[PDB]
A paper describes a structure:
Each of the two protein chains in the asymmetric unit binds one phosphate and one molecule of adenosine 5'–monophosphate (5’AMP) in the same binding mode. Phosphate is one product of the 3’–mononucleotidase activity, 5’AMP is a product of nuclease activity. Phosphate is present inside the zinc cluster, 5’AMP occupies the NBS1 site in an inverted orientation with respect to the standard substrate/product binding (the ribose moiety is far from the zinc cluster). One of the phosphate oxygen atoms replaces the water molecule W1 and binds almost symmetrically between Zn1 and Zn2. Another oxygen atom binds asymmetrically between Zn1 and Zn3 replacing W2. The phosphate moiety of 5’AMP interacts not with the zinc cluster but instead with Asp83Oδ2 of NBS1 through a sodium ion. The adenine base binds inside NBS1 in a position almost exactly above and parallel to the side chain of Phe81. The water molecule WNBS1 is substituted by the amino group of the adenine base, which enables a deeper penetration of the ligand, and therefore we denote this binding mode as deep. Hydrogen bonding to Asp83 is realized through the Hoogsteen face of adenine.
Residue numbers in the entry: 21 to 287
The structure:
Amino acid sequence: WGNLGHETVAYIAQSFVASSTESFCQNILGDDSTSYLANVATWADTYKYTDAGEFSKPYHFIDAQDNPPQSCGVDYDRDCGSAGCSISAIQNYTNILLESPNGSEALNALKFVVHIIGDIHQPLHDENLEAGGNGIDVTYDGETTNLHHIWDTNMPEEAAGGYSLSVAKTYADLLTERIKTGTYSSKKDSWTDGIDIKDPVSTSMIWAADANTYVCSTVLDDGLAYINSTDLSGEYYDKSQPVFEELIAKAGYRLAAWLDLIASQPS
Ligand SMILES: Nc1ncnc2c1ncn2[C@@H]1O[C@H](COP(=O)(O)O)[C@@H](O)[C@H]1O
Ligand SMILES: *[C@@H]1O[C@H](CO)[C@@H](O)[C@H](O)[C@H]1NC(C)=O
Ligand SMILES: *[C@@H]1O[C@H](CO)[C@@H](O)[C@H](O)[C@H]1NC(C)=O
Ligand SMILES: [Ca+2]
Ligand SMILES: [Ca+2]
Ligand SMILES: [Ca+2]
Ligand code: NA
Ligand code: NA
Ligand SMILES: [Zn+2]
Ligand SMILES: [Zn+2]
Ligand SMILES: [Zn+2]
């Protein structure tokens, strides 16, 4: 996701973490503001464009080598790669926070977890094709862009009504209510099925696999003829909105559950 997406996920997590988890995190981050997670949710995206952080570029995604929209699937051993991926990163950085939450590495580890759990839920971050669709040019609201970009940025920002931190906060509130009492409230207790602090690879693979199903059902199900030749701000946006909104919600809720486990469970 772009910035609004990451901040939204983070504000959602803030609304579900236990009070003791909130403490734990605030302490690591040196920030007790009401935006403590949201304030760090985009950091990894800066860092990957620096010399020092170049190594972390692969940690944003897992390039699933499947055949959408006919066949979707992710496989850790097949798809992670020699430089690492989102899944291996969640393993590493979770372990750092489990075993060395007061070491020098904890602060970045936590910032990475916050960001990467968000990225795992962007379906095109779990797809190899055309570099997660970056190489697929599209039209959106009369302008040329690419498919990855409209998922990261144009569509969620249109849905939210903007792109700043304050807009992220309002969008997070909308989606948080959907989890607590609204249209996601009867499904959300299944969203944490299979979660296991002692098997970060399995756990993050569940999430990556879940998001990847939407590559087939939603992102590319219209086919490339339609994707290449229509303005995707019409019916395509209408079809995609309930999916990206649910996935952002899942990311925030799963992030909260994960942080709660980090702040409380043994290795
Ligand atoms: N699923 C993805 N989501 C976002 N960026 C990606 C994805 N897959 C590859 N990329 C980026 O696209 C570029 C080329 O990808 P590759 O040919 O897999 O090395 C690299 O800079 C990758 O970081
Ligand atoms: C684990 O984290 C350290 C600290 O950022 C990093 O330098 C190392 O490359 C990481 N390894 C993996 C496999 O994520
Ligand atoms: C759609 O465009 C992509 C490149 O952006 C190309 O790979 C693909 O073959 C095109 N498909 C059709 C049916 O035009
Ligand atoms: Ca942006
Ligand atoms: Ca139910
Ligand atoms: Ca359950
Ligand atoms: Na790759
Ligand atoms: Na611990
Ligand atoms: Zn992102
Ligand atoms: Zn992206
Ligand atoms: Zn990212």
